Each structure stands twice: as C-alpha cells, then as structure tokens.
Design an enzyme around this catalytic site. Sequence first.
Site, PDB file in Angstrom:
ATOM      1  N   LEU B  13       7.883   1.263   3.122  1.00  0.00           N
ATOM      2  CA  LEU B  13       8.474   1.430   1.794  1.00  0.00           C
ATOM      3  C   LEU B  13       7.536   0.927   0.709  1.00  0.00           C
ATOM      4  O   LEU B  13       7.420   1.540  -0.354  1.00  0.00           O
ATOM      5  CB  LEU B  13       9.794   0.667   1.701  1.00  0.00           C
ATOM      6  CG  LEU B  13      10.933   1.098   2.621  1.00  0.00           C
ATOM      7  CD1 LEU B  13      12.064   0.106   2.500  1.00  0.00           C
ATOM      8  CD2 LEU B  13      11.399   2.517   2.296  1.00  0.00           C
ATOM      9  N   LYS B  15       3.918  -2.062  -0.044  1.00  0.00           N
ATOM     10  CA  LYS B  15       2.892  -2.982   0.432  1.00  0.00           C
ATOM     11  C   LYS B  15       2.348  -3.811  -0.725  1.00  0.00           C
ATOM     12  O   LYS B  15       2.145  -3.301  -1.832  1.00  0.00           O
ATOM     13  CB  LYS B  15       1.754  -2.194   1.099  1.00  0.00           C
ATOM     14  CG  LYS B  15       0.927  -2.975   2.109  1.00  0.00           C
ATOM     15  CD  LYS B  15      -0.009  -2.049   2.873  1.00  0.00           C
ATOM     16  CE  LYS B  15      -0.701  -2.778   4.017  1.00  0.00           C
ATOM     17  NZ  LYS B  15      -1.568  -1.866   4.816  1.00  0.00           N
ATOM     18  N   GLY B  16       2.155  -5.098  -0.458  1.00  0.00           N
ATOM     19  CA  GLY B  16       1.610  -6.013  -1.445  1.00  0.00           C
ATOM     20  C   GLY B  16       0.249  -6.485  -0.972  1.00  0.00           C
ATOM     21  O   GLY B  16      -0.290  -5.963   0.013  1.00  0.00           O
ATOM     22  N   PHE B  18      -0.158  -9.461   0.042  1.00  0.00           N
ATOM     23  CA  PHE B  18       0.203 -10.501   1.010  1.00  0.00           C
ATOM     24  C   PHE B  18       0.991  -9.954   2.207  1.00  0.00           C
ATOM     25  O   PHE B  18       0.706 -10.321   3.354  1.00  0.00           O
ATOM     26  CB  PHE B  18       1.025 -11.619   0.337  1.00  0.00           C
ATOM     27  CG  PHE B  18       0.386 -12.210  -0.901  1.00  0.00           C
ATOM     28  CD1 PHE B  18       1.018 -12.079  -2.155  1.00  0.00           C
ATOM     29  CD2 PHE B  18      -0.845 -12.898  -0.828  1.00  0.00           C
ATOM     30  CE1 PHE B  18       0.435 -12.623  -3.337  1.00  0.00           C
ATOM     31  CE2 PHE B  18      -1.449 -13.451  -1.998  1.00  0.00           C
ATOM     32  CZ  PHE B  18      -0.805 -13.313  -3.256  1.00  0.00           C
ATOM     33  N   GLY B  19       1.973  -9.087   1.937  1.00  0.00           N
ATOM     34  CA  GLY B  19       2.795  -8.517   2.999  1.00  0.00           C
ATOM     35  C   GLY B  19       3.314  -7.103   2.794  1.00  0.00           C
ATOM     36  O   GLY B  19       3.116  -6.503   1.732  1.00  0.00           O
ATOM     37  N   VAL B  21       6.679  -4.089   3.415  1.00  0.00           N
ATOM     38  CA  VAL B  21       8.128  -3.845   3.494  1.00  0.00           C
ATOM     39  C   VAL B  21       8.360  -2.520   4.226  1.00  0.00           C
ATOM     40  O   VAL B  21       7.906  -1.466   3.783  1.00  0.00           O
ATOM     41  CB  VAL B  21       8.806  -3.826   2.086  1.00  0.00           C
ATOM     42  CG1 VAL B  21      10.331  -3.680   2.214  1.00  0.00           C
ATOM     43  CG2 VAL B  21       8.486  -5.111   1.329  1.00  0.00           C
ATOM     44  N   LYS B  36      10.888  -7.282   4.988  1.00  0.00           N
ATOM     45  CA  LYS B  36       9.654  -7.772   4.391  1.00  0.00           C
ATOM     46  C   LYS B  36       8.979  -8.650   5.446  1.00  0.00           C
ATOM     47  O   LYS B  36       9.534  -9.670   5.871  1.00  0.00           O
ATOM     48  CB  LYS B  36       9.922  -8.572   3.108  1.00  0.00           C
ATOM     49  CG  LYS B  36       8.653  -8.994   2.375  1.00  0.00           C
ATOM     50  CD  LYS B  36       8.947  -9.657   1.051  1.00  0.00           C
ATOM     51  CE  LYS B  36       7.648 -10.047   0.361  1.00  0.00           C
ATOM     52  NZ  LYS B  36       7.904 -10.575  -1.008  1.00  0.00           N
ATOM     53  N   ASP B 130       8.667 -13.309 -12.082  1.00  0.00           N
ATOM     54  CA  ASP B 130       7.953 -12.064 -11.794  1.00  0.00           C
ATOM     55  C   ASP B 130       8.704 -10.772 -12.153  1.00  0.00           C
ATOM     56  O   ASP B 130       8.700  -9.810 -11.370  1.00  0.00           O
ATOM     57  CB  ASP B 130       7.488 -12.055 -10.318  1.00  0.00           C
ATOM     58  CG  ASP B 130       6.325 -11.089 -10.064  1.00  0.00           C
ATOM     59  OD1 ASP B 130       5.646 -10.691 -11.034  1.00  0.00           O
ATOM     60  OD2 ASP B 130       6.096 -10.721  -8.893  1.00  0.00           O
ATOM     61  N   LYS B 132       9.265  -7.361 -13.320  1.00  0.00           N
ATOM     62  CA  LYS B 132       8.415  -6.187 -13.439  1.00  0.00           C
ATOM     63  C   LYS B 132       9.106  -4.981 -12.852  1.00  0.00           C
ATOM     64  O   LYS B 132       9.987  -5.122 -12.006  1.00  0.00           O
ATOM     65  CB  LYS B 132       7.028  -6.395 -12.804  1.00  0.00           C
ATOM     66  CG  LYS B 132       6.963  -6.644 -11.325  1.00  0.00           C
ATOM     67  CD  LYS B 132       5.512  -6.756 -10.937  1.00  0.00           C
ATOM     68  CE  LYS B 132       5.353  -7.110  -9.491  1.00  0.00           C
ATOM     69  NZ  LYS B 132       3.921  -7.328  -9.127  1.00  0.00           N
ATOM     70  N   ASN B 135       9.502  -4.649  -9.083  1.00  0.00           N
ATOM     71  CA  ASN B 135      10.463  -5.585  -8.484  1.00  0.00           C
ATOM     72  C   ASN B 135      11.922  -5.283  -8.814  1.00  0.00           C
ATOM     73  O   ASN B 135      12.827  -5.952  -8.308  1.00  0.00           O
ATOM     74  CB  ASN B 135      10.149  -7.023  -8.909  1.00  0.00           C
ATOM     75  CG  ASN B 135       8.912  -7.577  -8.237  1.00  0.00           C
ATOM     76  OD1 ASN B 135       8.352  -6.951  -7.338  1.00  0.00           O
ATOM     77  ND2 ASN B 135       8.484  -8.765  -8.663  1.00  0.00           N
ATOM     78  N   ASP B 148      12.070  -9.210  -4.378  1.00  0.00           N
ATOM     79  CA  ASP B 148      10.860 -10.043  -4.476  1.00  0.00           C
ATOM     80  C   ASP B 148      11.054 -11.382  -5.202  1.00  0.00           C
ATOM     81  O   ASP B 148      10.712 -11.533  -6.382  1.00  0.00           O
ATOM     82  CB  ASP B 148       9.707  -9.229  -5.094  1.00  0.00           C
ATOM     83  CG  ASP B 148       8.372  -9.964  -5.084  1.00  0.00           C
ATOM     84  OD1 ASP B 148       8.240 -11.006  -4.399  1.00  0.00           O
ATOM     85  OD2 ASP B 148       7.445  -9.491  -5.771  1.00  0.00           O
TER      86      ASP B 148
HETATM   87  N1  LIG Z   1      15.079  -4.646  -0.542  1.00  0.00           N
HETATM   88  C1  LIG Z   1      14.204  -3.653  -0.720  1.00  0.00           C
HETATM   89  N2  LIG Z   1      14.603  -2.339  -0.548  1.00  0.00           N
HETATM   90  C2  LIG Z   1      13.712  -1.346  -0.729  1.00  0.00           C
HETATM   91  N3  LIG Z   1      12.416  -1.462  -1.076  1.00  0.00           N
HETATM   92  C3  LIG Z   1      12.056  -2.789  -1.239  1.00  0.00           C
HETATM   93  C4  LIG Z   1      12.860  -3.893  -1.084  1.00  0.00           C
HETATM   94  N4  LIG Z   1      12.155  -5.063  -1.328  1.00  0.00           N
HETATM   95  C5  LIG Z   1      10.967  -4.651  -1.621  1.00  0.00           C
HETATM   96  N5  LIG Z   1      10.819  -3.274  -1.594  1.00  0.00           N
HETATM   97  C6  LIG Z   1       9.624  -2.461  -1.879  1.00  0.00           C
HETATM   98  O1  LIG Z   1       8.437  -3.095  -1.364  1.00  0.00           O
HETATM   99  C7  LIG Z   1       7.524  -3.376  -2.451  1.00  0.00           C
HETATM  100  C8  LIG Z   1       6.816  -4.691  -2.209  1.00  0.00           C
HETATM  101  O2  LIG Z   1       7.774  -5.720  -1.891  1.00  0.00           O
HETATM  102  P1  LIG Z   1       7.665  -7.152  -2.607  1.00  0.00           P
HETATM  103  O3  LIG Z   1       8.744  -7.985  -2.077  1.00  0.00           O
HETATM  104  O4  LIG Z   1       7.569  -6.942  -4.078  1.00  0.00           O
HETATM  105  O5  LIG Z   1       6.226  -7.624  -2.029  1.00  0.00           O
HETATM  106  P2  LIG Z   1       5.179  -8.630  -2.720  1.00  0.00           P
HETATM  107  O6  LIG Z   1       4.036  -8.748  -1.845  1.00  0.00           O
HETATM  108  O7  LIG Z   1       5.887  -9.884  -3.054  1.00  0.00           O
HETATM  109  N6  LIG Z   1       4.682  -7.888  -4.139  1.00  0.00           N
HETATM  110  P3  LIG Z   1       4.019  -8.602  -5.487  1.00  0.00           P
HETATM  111  O8  LIG Z   1       4.141 -10.110  -5.290  1.00  0.00           O
HETATM  112  O9  LIG Z   1       4.855  -8.034  -6.556  1.00  0.00           O
HETATM  113  O10 LIG Z   1       2.630  -8.191  -5.611  1.00  0.00           O
HETATM  114  C9  LIG Z   1       8.381  -3.389  -3.708  1.00  0.00           C
HETATM  115  O11 LIG Z   1       7.642  -3.181  -4.913  1.00  0.00           O
HETATM  116  C10 LIG Z   1       9.407  -2.333  -3.381  1.00  0.00           C
HETATM  117  O12 LIG Z   1       8.891  -1.024  -3.685  1.00  0.00           O
HETATM  118 MN   LIG Z   2       6.008 -11.095  -4.845  1.00  0.00          MN
HETATM  119 MN   LIG Z   3       6.765  -7.339  -5.913  1.00  0.00          MN
END
Ligand SMILES: Nc1ncnc2c1ncn2[C@@H]1O[C@H](COP(=O)(O)OP(=O)(O)NP(=O)(O)O)[C@@H](O)[C@H]1O
Ligand SMILES: [Mn+2]
Ligand SMILES: [Mn+2]
Lengths: 10, 318
Positions: B13, B15-16, B18-19, B21, B36, B130, B132, B135, B148
């Site tokens: 779904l 990708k960041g 760090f991790g 989803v 996640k 955060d 945005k 998120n 997030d």
């Molecule tokens: N509960 C969810 N349902 C559907 N998609 C999700 C969900 N949580 C996260 N995502 C998707 O996955 C992406 C990345 O998840 P996120 O938790 O934001 O990762 P992150 O590494 O913390 N990103 P960031 O810190 O913003 O650079 C999001 O921008 C969404 O598109």
């Molecule tokens: Mn984040």
């Molecule tokens: Mn995010």
Amino acid sequence: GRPRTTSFAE
Amino acid sequence: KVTMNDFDYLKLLGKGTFGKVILVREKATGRYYAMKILRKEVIIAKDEVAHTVTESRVLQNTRHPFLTALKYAFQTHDRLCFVMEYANGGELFFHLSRERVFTEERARFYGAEIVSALEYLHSRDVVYRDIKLENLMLDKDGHIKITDFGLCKEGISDGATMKTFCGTPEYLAPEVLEDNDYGRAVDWWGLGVVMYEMMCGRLPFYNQDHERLFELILMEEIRFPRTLSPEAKSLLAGLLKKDPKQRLGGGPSDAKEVMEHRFFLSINWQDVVQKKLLPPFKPQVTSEVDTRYFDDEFTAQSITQRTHFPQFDYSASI
Ligand SMILES: Nc1ncnc2c1ncn2[C@@H]1O[C@H](COP(=O)(O)OP(=O)(O)NP(=O)(O)O)[C@@H](O)[C@H]1O
Ligand SMILES: [Mn+2]
Ligand SMILES: [Mn+2]
C-alpha cells in the site's frame, strides 16, 4: 505538481 | 498471541524511508487490515527506539472515529508489526493530486474531521507533529482516518514543550526551524498547510532544495487566490501565522480557537465526532482488495531476549 514528501528526525 | 503466519500478504500500500505498509488478510476471521512493518536493526542503529515505542503507545491508547485504530501490535526476531484498520479510500494526497483542488465545502468537511482528531489528541496530551496529505487517509465511507503516529510526543499538557527537530520539510512550522523548544501549536500550522493545499491547489511554500524551502517558511509571506472566500483567507492567514503565540489555535484554549472560527460556523462539532455528516466523496471500491486509490508505484511491486522492544504485544478488546 508536488512530489511525495517523507519525514525526518534528527 | 499473534504471529506473522496468521496473515495472508496481498499487496504493498505504501513505503517510507524506514518501513512498509502491506494489505493483509487475517486467516481466521477473513478480515482485511493494513500492516506497518518496521525493521528492528534500522531503528536501533538510528537511535529511534523511543519514537517507535511512542507510536505503539499512541496506537494502543487512542479511541476516536478519525484516528486509525489498532487491532494488534506484535514483534518477531527482526521485525515490528502494527496491524491497523485498513483505509480503503487511500491518501488525501492521491485525491488532491488527481482533482488539483477541492471546493471550500469539501475542504471544510475534511478540515473539521482533522480538527476533531487533533482536539482529541491534544486532550490526551499528545502532539502529532506530522500533519500531511500522505498521513491523512479516507476510510471506505469517505471519512478521515489519520494514520502514521511515528513522530507523536506524549505527556505534552497545556504549554509544555518539545525539543526534537522532526517532521516533514514542506510542513515544518517556523518555530521548529528555530533553536530551542516549541509547543503544541505546530499541529495547527500543519492543519494550515493541508487546508491551503486543499483550497489553493499548491503548497504555501515550495522549493526542491530544503535550505531554500526553510528560508521560504521562515521569511516569505503567504499569497491567496483573489476568488478565495474571505472566511477561508482568514482561516489560512490565522493557521499560517509564523509566530505560534499569534496563530489560530496557538492560545491557551488550543482547538477552541480553530473550532470557533467563522469558516467553521456551519459546523456542529458533536455531529462531526458522531459521524452524522454525509461525506462529499465515497470511495468506489468493489471489494476489500480493491486498491484503486493507492499509487501504482506501490501496488505493482512484488512482496517477498536482548532485542525485545518494550510496551508492544497488544490485542484489541473491541
Ligand atoms: N492504516 C492504513 N491504511 C491504508 N494505508 C495506510 C495505512 N497506514 C499507512 N498507510 C499507507 O502507507 C504509507 C506509509 O505509511 P506511514 O505510516 O506513513 O509510514 P512512514 O514510514 O511513517 N512515513 P513518513 O514518516 O511519513 O515518511 C502512507 O502514506 C499510506 O499511504
Ligand atoms: Mn512516519
Ligand atoms: Mn507517513
């Protein structure tokens, strides 16, 4: 436009 | 106890840095969730343990209709997993990028739900940090689901401050770009940036180079389209005030200042939290595996005790 933005932490 | 083999891994779904989803299906129940997955080795090396424990604690202890609910939180020998409720509607970023701009009434609906969620978080002494478009998700009905919680900070009551230089570059508040500490008002600036993007079709400040972008956030004044309503111009000018003390929501009453602004005059705050308002857009998903509201860049990709993290291992009662 605007591309995807990612987070950071110092 | 919850393990990795209790789920079917369908598709990516998001990708960041760090991790990742992934859309999963629980074998025993047949229910779909968003998992996640975070790698332990990367988190320990970057000294990000405290932030990851906070992400877990916030996901476990929060209960609000506009915040993504956690079903399970577990860990393996090398991975950390969050089994969250799946937001079928995708990111607000997907919809805004497609539609270029939203109407003021559509932006008001999303904005009202974000304010309700931020009010709840601030009342539980949590600052999000955060806000945005990436998120802010939409569920199957079209309601906001903030996801997030990776940069959240607990124990921040009233005028308590934070010191970590964190967030997303384009969304950073001017005070975070200054030395020393900052308060909870950073979330209202973030709300201001997303409301600006929704109503004006672009970021208030932008440059590909982060150094130049930071100069714009600190020094440049905001501009508004001539046709934008006076109540919208006032909301944005208030949320996007550089000084947190002069900012809408930056005073002692916090969320009350935002809630009582004339832009939200037609909003009944109890109708918002109780989900009584009709969504201006309902996701047209045919099945629970339908990921049409997620970018092809992610969904087309193929997927293939000393290290024990504290305050994990959760299972929801509801
Ligand atoms: N509960 C969810 N349902 C559907 N998609 C999700 C969900 N949580 C996260 N995502 C998707 O996955 C992406 C990345 O998840 P996120 O938790 O934001 O990762 P992150 O590494 O913390 N990103 P960031 O810190 O913003 O650079 C999001 O921008 C969404 O598109
Ligand atoms: Mn984040
Ligand atoms: Mn995010």
